[PDB]
Design a binder for this molecule. Structure first.
Ligand code: ZN
Ligand code: ZN
Ligand code: ZN
Ligand code: ZN
Ligand code: ZN
Ligand code: ZN
Lengths: 123, 123
């Protein structure tokens, strides 16, 4: 009864440069015969003041998506090649391929999520 | 002070066949000079027992991603060409291009989300 169209074995924690524990992926390049994007992320309520990674880079563009049940329920700081940016939920920020970046949770409620959508199949 | 790398004007509600209110997009094909995927969705806590759409189709493959703060905090029913499937968070389900489908929220907590990731730039 494993259904080839359904993946329940999630997240998929992958070692990523800059991270100190594996990053939680929900879409990987090897799913469903091959995907054109990857997607990692997670719930932020326990991460306020606790960054997941140091400044790091990807060979592909990556979009951050920040959501929370209440409008403005979550806020993150993003460093983009050394320049601080902030996002207030809901928001999306583009991180160009090669840009040294990371994010920090400054505010979150139960149900705040940040996802990174990697526009390619390599890390 | 609009930053070209940040979109705060979200969601973007788009008219979609089968839906009775516009669907909330967070990534659209026209963002950042052109994106190769689109992404729509939202928080499910108020949607238990309330479907967003009738059976409908897309010209591209679409991946459902279901997450919730607690393991198993959310459950959805997906109809795939008339066959009922269920997803327990966290889960991902592939919906092939052309497949008549829809989902129904059967259980959700504060912070449950379902997103559809459309693998292309057309609807
Ligand atoms: Zn099936
Ligand atoms: Zn840590
Ligand atoms: Zn990154
Ligand atoms: Zn800037
Ligand atoms: Zn409705
Ligand atoms: Zn659909």
């Amino acid at each position: 009864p494993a259904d080839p169209e359904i993946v329940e074995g999630l997240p998929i924690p992958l070692a990523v440069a800059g991270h100190h524990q594996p990053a939680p992926f929900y879409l990987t390049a090897d799913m469903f015969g091959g995907l054109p994007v990857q997607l990692a992320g997670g719930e932020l309520s326990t991460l306020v003041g606790k960054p997941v990674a140091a400044p790091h880079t990807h060979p592909v563009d990556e979009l951050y998506l920040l959501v929370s049940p209440n409008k403005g329920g979550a806020r993150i700081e993003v460093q983009l090649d050394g320049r601080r940016h902030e996002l207030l939920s809901p928001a999306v920020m583009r991180i160009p391929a090669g840009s040294e970046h990371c994010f920090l949770t400054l505010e979150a409620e139960v149900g705040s999520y940040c996802f990174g959508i990697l526009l390619g199949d390599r890390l």
